Amino acid sequence: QTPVQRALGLLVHREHSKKELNRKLQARGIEPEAAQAAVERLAGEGWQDDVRFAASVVRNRASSGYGPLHIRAELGTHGLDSDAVSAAMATFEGDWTENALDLIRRRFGEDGPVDLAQRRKAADLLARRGFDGNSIRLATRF
């Protein structure tokens, strides 16, 4: 398939960032300038949009137990600047601390982590998932 056909097929699945599409196309042997041109053509035709992509990441990661620090870091790797990341984070209407508490409840139950081993595991899990210090301290009953 042509670079445009390949990129379109990816967008049919989900929103992709310009940087992400470029990387995926280049991974298939497509030359840099040709990959970039395909992405710009799709953006111009209304198929690709980094703003919609960023909002989709915030939404999807939030509902899958990832924290704000993780999401901000991830969006940054897609070449999005501070204002773009802030705008995306602003689309979240939930409570990140509540999401951390929910993840812990789903794993350990209503009583949360009991012994030291479990509390350490809970802290490690929330840190890896990108939650803030306050959220982790609250969820681990620190």
Side-chain angles (χ1 to χ4, degrees):
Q1 301 184 301
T2 61
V4 175
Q5 293 179 305
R6 294 184 180 178
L8 178 55
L10 290 173
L11 293 167
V12 167
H13 169 48
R14 64 166 171 80
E15 298 286 346
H16 282 66
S17 75
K18 294 181 189 301
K19 185 176 178 185
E20 178 176 44
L21 287 176
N22 192 304
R23 176 176 60 67
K24 289 186 175 184
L25 290 181
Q26 285 198 50
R28 286 194 176 299
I30 298 175
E31 285 304 307
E33 307 193 331
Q36 164 59 191
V39 175
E40 289 305 308
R41 180 181 177 74
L42 289 171
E45 303 195 328
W47 283 99
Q48 195 288 321
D49 189 294
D50 274 1
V51 176
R52 286 190 305 175
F53 165 74
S56 73
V57 171
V58 171
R59 187 196 322 137
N60 294 172
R61 300 295 178 287
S63 62
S64 57
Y66 292 84
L69 306 181
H70 168 90
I71 297 170
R72 280 173 173 282
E74 180 172 15
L75 291 175
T77 67
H78 280 86
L80 307 180
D81 67 13
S82 67
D83 291 70
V85 174
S86 290
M89 292 299 284
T91 66
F92 180 65
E93 294 298 303
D95 179 333
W96 297 110
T97 299
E98 263 300 300
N99 285 188
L101 292 172
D102 171 69
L103 172 56
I104 295 306
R105 287 193 293 260
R106 289 189 278 112
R107 176 168 185 144
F108 298 104
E110 284 295 315
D111 295 313
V114 180
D115 60 14
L116 182 55
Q118 288 191 172
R119 293 179 65 266
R120 276 170 171 165
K121 177 75 66 178
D124 174 70
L125 169 65
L126 294 175
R128 283 186 287 107
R129 287 299 185 78
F131 285 89
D132 58 286
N134 181 61
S135 294
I136 302 181
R137 286 187 288 279
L138 178 65
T140 61
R141 286 67 167 174
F142 175 92

mmCIF file with all atom_site columns, all heavy atoms in Angstrom, residues 65-87:
data_model
loop_
_atom_site.group_PDB
_atom_site.id
_atom_site.type_symbol
_atom_site.label_atom_id
_atom_site.label_alt_id
_atom_site.label_comp_id
_atom_site.label_asym_id
_atom_site.label_entity_id
_atom_site.label_seq_id
_atom_site.pdbx_PDB_ins_code
_atom_site.Cartn_x
_atom_site.Cartn_y
_atom_site.Cartn_z
_atom_site.occupancy
_atom_site.B_iso_or_equiv
_atom_site.pdbx_formal_charge
_atom_site.auth_seq_id
_atom_site.auth_comp_id
_atom_site.auth_asym_id
_atom_site.auth_atom_id
_atom_site.pdbx_PDB_model_num
ATOM 1   N N   . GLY A 1 65 ? -6.552 3.382  34.312 1.00 0.00 ? 65 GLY A N   1
ATOM 2   C CA  . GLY A 1 65 ? -5.716 3.452  35.496 1.00 0.00 ? 65 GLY A CA  1
ATOM 3   C C   . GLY A 1 65 ? -4.343 4.093  35.433 1.00 0.00 ? 65 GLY A C   1
ATOM 4   O O   . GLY A 1 65 ? -3.453 3.692  36.186 1.00 0.00 ? 65 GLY A O   1
ATOM 5   N N   . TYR A 1 66 ? -4.150 5.066  34.547 1.00 0.00 ? 66 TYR A N   1
ATOM 6   C CA  . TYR A 1 66 ? -2.867 5.759  34.477 1.00 0.00 ? 66 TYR A CA  1
ATOM 7   C C   . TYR A 1 66 ? -3.044 7.149  35.060 1.00 0.00 ? 66 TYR A C   1
ATOM 8   O O   . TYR A 1 66 ? -4.119 7.750  34.950 1.00 0.00 ? 66 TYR A O   1
ATOM 9   C CB  . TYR A 1 66 ? -2.354 5.854  33.040 1.00 0.00 ? 66 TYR A CB  1
ATOM 10  C CG  . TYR A 1 66 ? -1.967 4.514  32.471 1.00 0.00 ? 66 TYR A CG  1
ATOM 11  C CD1 . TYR A 1 66 ? -2.924 3.677  31.909 1.00 0.00 ? 66 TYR A CD1 1
ATOM 12  C CD2 . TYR A 1 66 ? -0.650 4.061  32.544 1.00 0.00 ? 66 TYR A CD2 1
ATOM 13  C CE1 . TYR A 1 66 ? -2.582 2.414  31.430 1.00 0.00 ? 66 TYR A CE1 1
ATOM 14  C CE2 . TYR A 1 66 ? -0.299 2.796  32.071 1.00 0.00 ? 66 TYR A CE2 1
ATOM 15  C CZ  . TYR A 1 66 ? -1.272 1.981  31.516 1.00 0.00 ? 66 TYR A CZ  1
ATOM 16  O OH  . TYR A 1 66 ? -0.946 0.728  31.046 1.00 0.00 ? 66 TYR A OH  1
ATOM 17  N N   . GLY A 1 67 ? -1.985 7.649  35.692 1.00 0.00 ? 67 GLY A N   1
ATOM 18  C CA  . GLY A 1 67 ? -2.037 8.952  36.329 1.00 0.00 ? 67 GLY A CA  1
ATOM 19  C C   . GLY A 1 67 ? -1.602 10.125 35.472 1.00 0.00 ? 67 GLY A C   1
ATOM 20  O O   . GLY A 1 67 ? -1.035 9.947  34.393 1.00 0.00 ? 67 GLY A O   1
ATOM 21  N N   . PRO A 1 68 ? -1.830 11.353 35.963 1.00 0.00 ? 68 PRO A N   1
ATOM 22  C CA  . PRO A 1 68 ? -1.486 12.593 35.263 1.00 0.00 ? 68 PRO A CA  1
ATOM 23  C C   . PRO A 1 68 ? -0.026 12.763 34.869 1.00 0.00 ? 68 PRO A C   1
ATOM 24  O O   . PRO A 1 68 ? 0.270  13.320 33.808 1.00 0.00 ? 68 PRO A O   1
ATOM 25  C CB  . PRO A 1 68 ? -1.975 13.677 36.222 1.00 0.00 ? 68 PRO A CB  1
ATOM 26  C CG  . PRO A 1 68 ? -1.821 13.035 37.570 1.00 0.00 ? 68 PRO A CG  1
ATOM 27  C CD  . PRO A 1 68 ? -2.348 11.640 37.312 1.00 0.00 ? 68 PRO A CD  1
ATOM 28  N N   . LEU A 1 69 ? 0.890  12.289 35.705 1.00 0.00 ? 69 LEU A N   1
ATOM 29  C CA  . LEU A 1 69 ? 2.306  12.424 35.383 1.00 0.00 ? 69 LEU A CA  1
ATOM 30  C C   . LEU A 1 69 ? 2.663  11.530 34.194 1.00 0.00 ? 69 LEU A C   1
ATOM 31  O O   . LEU A 1 69 ? 3.446  11.920 33.323 1.00 0.00 ? 69 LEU A O   1
ATOM 32  C CB  . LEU A 1 69 ? 3.167  12.080 36.606 1.00 0.00 ? 69 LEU A CB  1
ATOM 33  C CG  . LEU A 1 69 ? 2.816  12.868 37.875 1.00 0.00 ? 69 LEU A CG  1
ATOM 34  C CD1 . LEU A 1 69 ? 3.755  12.452 38.995 1.00 0.00 ? 69 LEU A CD1 1
ATOM 35  C CD2 . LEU A 1 69 ? 2.915  14.371 37.626 1.00 0.00 ? 69 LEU A CD2 1
ATOM 36  N N   . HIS A 1 70 ? 2.082  10.334 34.153 1.00 0.00 ? 70 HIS A N   1
ATOM 37  C CA  . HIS A 1 70 ? 2.332  9.410  33.052 1.00 0.00 ? 70 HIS A CA  1
ATOM 38  C C   . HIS A 1 70 ? 1.803  9.991  31.748 1.00 0.00 ? 70 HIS A C   1
ATOM 39  O O   . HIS A 1 70 ? 2.499  10.002 30.732 1.00 0.00 ? 70 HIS A O   1
ATOM 40  C CB  . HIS A 1 70 ? 1.634  8.066  33.293 1.00 0.00 ? 70 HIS A CB  1
ATOM 41  C CG  . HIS A 1 70 ? 1.608  7.180  32.085 1.00 0.00 ? 70 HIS A CG  1
ATOM 42  N ND1 . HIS A 1 70 ? 2.602  6.267  31.808 1.00 0.00 ? 70 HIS A ND1 1
ATOM 43  C CD2 . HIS A 1 70 ? 0.729  7.102  31.057 1.00 0.00 ? 70 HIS A CD2 1
ATOM 44  C CE1 . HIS A 1 70 ? 2.339  5.665  30.661 1.00 0.00 ? 70 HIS A CE1 1
ATOM 45  N NE2 . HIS A 1 70 ? 1.208  6.155  30.184 1.00 0.00 ? 70 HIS A NE2 1
ATOM 46  N N   . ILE A 1 71 ? 0.561  10.466 31.790 1.00 0.00 ? 71 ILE A N   1
ATOM 47  C CA  . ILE A 1 71 ? -0.079 11.023 30.608 1.00 0.00 ? 71 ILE A CA  1
ATOM 48  C C   . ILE A 1 71 ? 0.659  12.247 30.070 1.00 0.00 ? 71 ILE A C   1
ATOM 49  O O   . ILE A 1 71 ? 0.853  12.372 28.859 1.00 0.00 ? 71 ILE A O   1
ATOM 50  C CB  . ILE A 1 71 ? -1.559 11.348 30.918 1.00 0.00 ? 71 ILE A CB  1
ATOM 51  C CG1 . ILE A 1 71 ? -2.287 10.036 31.254 1.00 0.00 ? 71 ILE A CG1 1
ATOM 52  C CG2 . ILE A 1 71 ? -2.218 12.043 29.724 1.00 0.00 ? 71 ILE A CG2 1
ATOM 53  C CD1 . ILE A 1 71 ? -3.688 10.204 31.802 1.00 0.00 ? 71 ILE A CD1 1
ATOM 54  N N   . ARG A 1 72 ? 1.086  13.141 30.958 1.00 0.00 ? 72 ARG A N   1
ATOM 55  C CA  . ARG A 1 72 ? 1.825  14.323 30.517 1.00 0.00 ? 72 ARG A CA  1
ATOM 56  C C   . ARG A 1 72 ? 3.131  13.909 29.851 1.00 0.00 ? 72 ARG A C   1
ATOM 57  O O   . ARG A 1 72 ? 3.512  14.457 28.812 1.00 0.00 ? 72 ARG A O   1
ATOM 58  C CB  . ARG A 1 72 ? 2.118  15.246 31.701 1.00 0.00 ? 72 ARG A CB  1
ATOM 59  C CG  . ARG A 1 72 ? 0.936  16.103 32.102 1.00 0.00 ? 72 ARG A CG  1
ATOM 60  C CD  . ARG A 1 72 ? 1.224  16.883 33.380 1.00 0.00 ? 72 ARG A CD  1
ATOM 61  N NE  . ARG A 1 72 ? 0.155  17.824 33.689 1.00 0.00 ? 72 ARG A NE  1
ATOM 62  C CZ  . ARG A 1 72 ? -0.006 19.001 33.087 1.00 0.00 ? 72 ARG A CZ  1
ATOM 63  N NH1 . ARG A 1 72 ? 0.840  19.388 32.140 1.00 0.00 ? 72 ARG A NH1 1
ATOM 64  N NH2 . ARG A 1 72 ? -1.015 19.787 33.430 1.00 0.00 ? 72 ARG A NH2 1
ATOM 65  N N   . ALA A 1 73 ? 3.821  12.944 30.446 1.00 0.00 ? 73 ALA A N   1
ATOM 66  C CA  . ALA A 1 73 ? 5.076  12.467 29.888 1.00 0.00 ? 73 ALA A CA  1
ATOM 67  C C   . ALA A 1 73 ? 4.832  11.829 28.523 1.00 0.00 ? 73 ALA A C   1
ATOM 68  O O   . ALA A 1 73 ? 5.584  12.061 27.577 1.00 0.00 ? 73 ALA A O   1
ATOM 69  C CB  . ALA A 1 73 ? 5.721  11.453 30.832 1.00 0.00 ? 73 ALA A CB  1
ATOM 70  N N   . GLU A 1 74 ? 3.780  11.023 28.419 1.00 0.00 ? 74 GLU A N   1
ATOM 71  C CA  . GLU A 1 74 ? 3.478  10.361 27.158 1.00 0.00 ? 74 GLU A CA  1
ATOM 72  C C   . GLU A 1 74 ? 3.170  11.378 26.063 1.00 0.00 ? 74 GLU A C   1
ATOM 73  O O   . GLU A 1 74 ? 3.697  11.273 24.956 1.00 0.00 ? 74 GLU A O   1
ATOM 74  C CB  . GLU A 1 74 ? 2.303  9.391  27.330 1.00 0.00 ? 74 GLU A CB  1
ATOM 75  C CG  . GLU A 1 74 ? 1.931  8.648  26.053 1.00 0.00 ? 74 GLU A CG  1
ATOM 76  C CD  . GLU A 1 74 ? 0.906  7.552  26.281 1.00 0.00 ? 74 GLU A CD  1
ATOM 77  O OE1 . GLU A 1 74 ? 0.267  7.533  27.358 1.00 0.00 ? 74 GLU A OE1 1
ATOM 78  O OE2 . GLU A 1 74 ? 0.736  6.710  25.375 1.00 0.00 ? 74 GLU A OE2 1
ATOM 79  N N   . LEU A 1 75 ? 2.331  12.362 26.370 1.00 0.00 ? 75 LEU A N   1
ATOM 80  C CA  . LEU A 1 75 ? 1.990  13.382 25.380 1.00 0.00 ? 75 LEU A CA  1
ATOM 81  C C   . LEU A 1 75 ? 3.235  14.145 24.939 1.00 0.00 ? 75 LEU A C   1
ATOM 82  O O   . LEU A 1 75 ? 3.361  14.537 23.774 1.00 0.00 ? 75 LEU A O   1
ATOM 83  C CB  . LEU A 1 75 ? 0.942  14.345 25.943 1.00 0.00 ? 75 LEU A CB  1
ATOM 84  C CG  . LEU A 1 75 ? -0.449 13.729 26.147 1.00 0.00 ? 75 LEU A CG  1
ATOM 85  C CD1 . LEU A 1 75 ? -1.364 14.732 26.823 1.00 0.00 ? 75 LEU A CD1 1
ATOM 86  C CD2 . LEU A 1 75 ? -1.021 13.301 24.790 1.00 0.00 ? 75 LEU A CD2 1
ATOM 87  N N   . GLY A 1 76 ? 4.161  14.345 25.869 1.00 0.00 ? 76 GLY A N   1
ATOM 88  C CA  . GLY A 1 76 ? 5.385  15.046 25.535 1.00 0.00 ? 76 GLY A CA  1
ATOM 89  C C   . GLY A 1 76 ? 6.212  14.300 24.504 1.00 0.00 ? 76 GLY A C   1
ATOM 90  O O   . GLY A 1 76 ? 6.844  14.930 23.646 1.00 0.00 ? 76 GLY A O   1
ATOM 91  N N   . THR A 1 77 ? 6.211  12.968 24.565 1.00 0.00 ? 77 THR A N   1
ATOM 92  C CA  . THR A 1 77 ? 6.985  12.170 23.620 1.00 0.00 ? 77 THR A CA  1
ATOM 93  C C   . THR A 1 77 ? 6.399  12.237 22.216 1.00 0.00 ? 77 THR A C   1
ATOM 94  O O   . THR A 1 77 ? 7.055  11.852 21.252 1.00 0.00 ? 77 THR A O   1
ATOM 95  C CB  . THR A 1 77 ? 7.084  10.679 24.038 1.00 0.00 ? 77 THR A CB  1
ATOM 96  O OG1 . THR A 1 77 ? 5.795  10.060 23.959 1.00 0.00 ? 77 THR A OG1 1
ATOM 97  C CG2 . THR A 1 77 ? 7.619  10.562 25.463 1.00 0.00 ? 77 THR A CG2 1
ATOM 98  N N   . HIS A 1 78 ? 5.165  12.718 22.099 1.00 0.00 ? 78 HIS A N   1
ATOM 99  C CA  . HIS A 1 78 ? 4.544  12.835 20.787 1.00 0.00 ? 78 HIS A CA  1
ATOM 100 C C   . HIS A 1 78 ? 4.820  14.209 20.181 1.00 0.00 ? 78 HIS A C   1
ATOM 101 O O   . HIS A 1 78 ? 4.170  14.623 19.220 1.00 0.00 ? 78 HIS A O   1
ATOM 102 C CB  . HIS A 1 78 ? 3.039  12.561 20.872 1.00 0.00 ? 78 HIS A CB  1
ATOM 103 C CG  . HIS A 1 78 ? 2.705  11.103 20.923 1.00 0.00 ? 78 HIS A CG  1
ATOM 104 N ND1 . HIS A 1 78 ? 2.671  10.381 22.097 1.00 0.00 ? 78 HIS A ND1 1
ATOM 105 C CD2 . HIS A 1 78 ? 2.459  10.215 19.931 1.00 0.00 ? 78 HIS A CD2 1
ATOM 106 C CE1 . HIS A 1 78 ? 2.418  9.114  21.825 1.00 0.00 ? 78 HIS A CE1 1
ATOM 107 N NE2 . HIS A 1 78 ? 2.285  8.987  20.517 1.00 0.00 ? 78 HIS A NE2 1
ATOM 108 N N   . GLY A 1 79 ? 5.800  14.903 20.755 1.00 0.00 ? 79 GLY A N   1
ATOM 109 C CA  . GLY A 1 79 ? 6.194  16.213 20.261 1.00 0.00 ? 79 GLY A CA  1
ATOM 110 C C   . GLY A 1 79 ? 5.240  17.356 20.543 1.00 0.00 ? 79 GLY A C   1
ATOM 111 O O   . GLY A 1 79 ? 5.300  18.392 19.883 1.00 0.00 ? 79 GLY A O   1
ATOM 112 N N   . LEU A 1 80 ? 4.363  17.178 21.524 1.00 0.00 ? 80 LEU A N   1
ATOM 113 C CA  . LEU A 1 80 ? 3.398  18.212 21.875 1.00 0.00 ? 80 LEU A CA  1
ATOM 114 C C   . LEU A 1 80 ? 3.996  19.137 22.933 1.00 0.00 ? 80 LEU A C   1
ATOM 115 O O   . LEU A 1 80 ? 4.566  18.667 23.917 1.00 0.00 ? 80 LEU A O   1
ATOM 116 C CB  . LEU A 1 80 ? 2.112  17.562 22.394 1.00 0.00 ? 80 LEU A CB  1
ATOM 117 C CG  . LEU A 1 80 ? 1.519  16.509 21.449 1.00 0.00 ? 80 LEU A CG  1
ATOM 118 C CD1 . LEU A 1 80 ? 0.258  15.924 22.052 1.00 0.00 ? 80 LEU A CD1 1
ATOM 119 C CD2 . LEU A 1 80 ? 1.219  17.138 20.091 1.00 0.00 ? 80 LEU A CD2 1
ATOM 120 N N   . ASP A 1 81 ? 3.869  20.447 22.731 1.00 0.00 ? 81 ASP A N   1
ATOM 121 C CA  . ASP A 1 81 ? 4.428  21.403 23.684 1.00 0.00 ? 81 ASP A CA  1
ATOM 122 C C   . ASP A 1 81 ? 3.563  21.609 24.929 1.00 0.00 ? 81 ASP A C   1
ATOM 123 O O   . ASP A 1 81 ? 2.468  21.056 25.036 1.00 0.00 ? 81 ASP A O   1
ATOM 124 C CB  . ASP A 1 81 ? 4.722  22.745 22.993 1.00 0.00 ? 81 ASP A CB  1
ATOM 125 C CG  . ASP A 1 81 ? 3.469  23.480 22.543 1.00 0.00 ? 81 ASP A CG  1
ATOM 126 O OD1 . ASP A 1 81 ? 2.352  23.111 22.958 1.00 0.00 ? 81 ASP A OD1 1
ATOM 127 O OD2 . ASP A 1 81 ? 3.612  24.453 21.768 1.00 0.00 ? 81 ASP A OD2 1
ATOM 128 N N   . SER A 1 82 ? 4.065  22.403 25.868 1.00 0.00 ? 82 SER A N   1
ATOM 129 C CA  . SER A 1 82 ? 3.364  22.656 27.125 1.00 0.00 ? 82 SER A CA  1
ATOM 130 C C   . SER A 1 82 ? 1.919  23.127 26.996 1.00 0.00 ? 82 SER A C   1
ATOM 131 O O   . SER A 1 82 ? 1.049  22.667 27.735 1.00 0.00 ? 82 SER A O   1
ATOM 132 C CB  . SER A 1 82 ? 4.151  23.658 27.977 1.00 0.00 ? 82 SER A CB  1
ATOM 133 O OG  . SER A 1 82 ? 4.181  24.938 27.372 1.00 0.00 ? 82 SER A OG  1
ATOM 134 N N   . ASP A 1 83 ? 1.654  24.045 26.073 1.00 0.00 ? 83 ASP A N   1
ATOM 135 C CA  . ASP A 1 83 ? 0.294  24.539 25.897 1.00 0.00 ? 83 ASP A CA  1
ATOM 136 C C   . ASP A 1 83 ? -0.639 23.457 25.363 1.00 0.00 ? 83 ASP A C   1
ATOM 137 O O   . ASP A 1 83 ? -1.806 23.384 25.754 1.00 0.00 ? 83 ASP A O   1
ATOM 138 C CB  . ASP A 1 83 ? 0.283  25.753 24.965 1.00 0.00 ? 83 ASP A CB  1
ATOM 139 C CG  . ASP A 1 83 ? 0.927  26.972 25.595 1.00 0.00 ? 83 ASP A CG  1
ATOM 140 O OD1 . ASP A 1 83 ? 2.162  26.970 25.780 1.00 0.00 ? 83 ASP A OD1 1
ATOM 141 O OD2 . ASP A 1 83 ? 0.195  27.930 25.917 1.00 0.00 ? 83 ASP A OD2 1
ATOM 142 N N   . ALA A 1 84 ? -0.124 22.613 24.473 1.00 0.00 ? 84 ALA A N   1
ATOM 143 C CA  . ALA A 1 84 ? -0.920 21.533 23.899 1.00 0.00 ? 84 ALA A CA  1
ATOM 144 C C   . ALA A 1 84 ? -1.220 20.479 24.965 1.00 0.00 ? 84 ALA A C   1
ATOM 145 O O   . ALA A 1 84 ? -2.323 19.933 25.023 1.00 0.00 ? 84 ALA A O   1
ATOM 146 C CB  . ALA A 1 84 ? -0.176 20.906 22.731 1.00 0.00 ? 84 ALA A CB  1
ATOM 147 N N   . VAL A 1 85 ? -0.235 20.195 25.810 1.00 0.00 ? 85 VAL A N   1
ATOM 148 C CA  . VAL A 1 85 ? -0.426 19.214 26.871 1.00 0.00 ? 85 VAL A CA  1
ATOM 149 C C   . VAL A 1 85 ? -1.442 19.741 27.884 1.00 0.00 ? 85 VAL A C   1
ATOM 150 O O   . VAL A 1 85 ? -2.333 19.012 28.315 1.00 0.00 ? 85 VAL A O   1
ATOM 151 C CB  . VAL A 1 85 ? 0.906  18.891 27.584 1.00 0.00 ? 85 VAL A CB  1
ATOM 152 C CG1 . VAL A 1 85 ? 0.652  17.980 28.779 1.00 0.00 ? 85 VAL A CG1 1
ATOM 153 C CG2 . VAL A 1 85 ? 1.868  18.221 26.610 1.00 0.00 ? 85 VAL A CG2 1
ATOM 154 N N   . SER A 1 86 ? -1.319 21.014 28.252 1.00 0.00 ? 86 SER A N   1
ATOM 155 C CA  . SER A 1 86 ? -2.244 21.625 29.204 1.00 0.00 ? 86 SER A CA  1
ATOM 156 C C   . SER A 1 86 ? -3.678 21.604 28.692 1.00 0.00 ? 86 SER A C   1
ATOM 157 O O   . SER A 1 86 ? -4.611 21.334 29.445 1.00 0.00 ? 86 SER A O   1
ATOM 158 C CB  . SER A 1 86 ? -1.850 23.077 29.490 1.00 0.00 ? 86 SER A CB  1
ATOM 159 O OG  . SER A 1 86 ? -0.655 23.150 30.241 1.00 0.00 ? 86 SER A OG  1
ATOM 160 N N   . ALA A 1 87 ? -3.851 21.907 27.407 1.00 0.00 ? 87 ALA A N   1
ATOM 161 C CA  . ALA A 1 87 ? -5.174 21.922 26.805 1.00 0.00 ? 87 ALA A CA  1
ATOM 162 C C   . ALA A 1 87 ? -5.788 20.531 26.868 1.00 0.00 ? 87 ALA A C   1
ATOM 163 O O   . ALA A 1 87 ? -6.972 20.378 27.159 1.00 0.00 ? 87 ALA A O   1
ATOM 164 C CB  . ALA A 1 87 ? -5.088 22.397 25.357 1.00 0.00 ? 87 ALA A CB  1
#
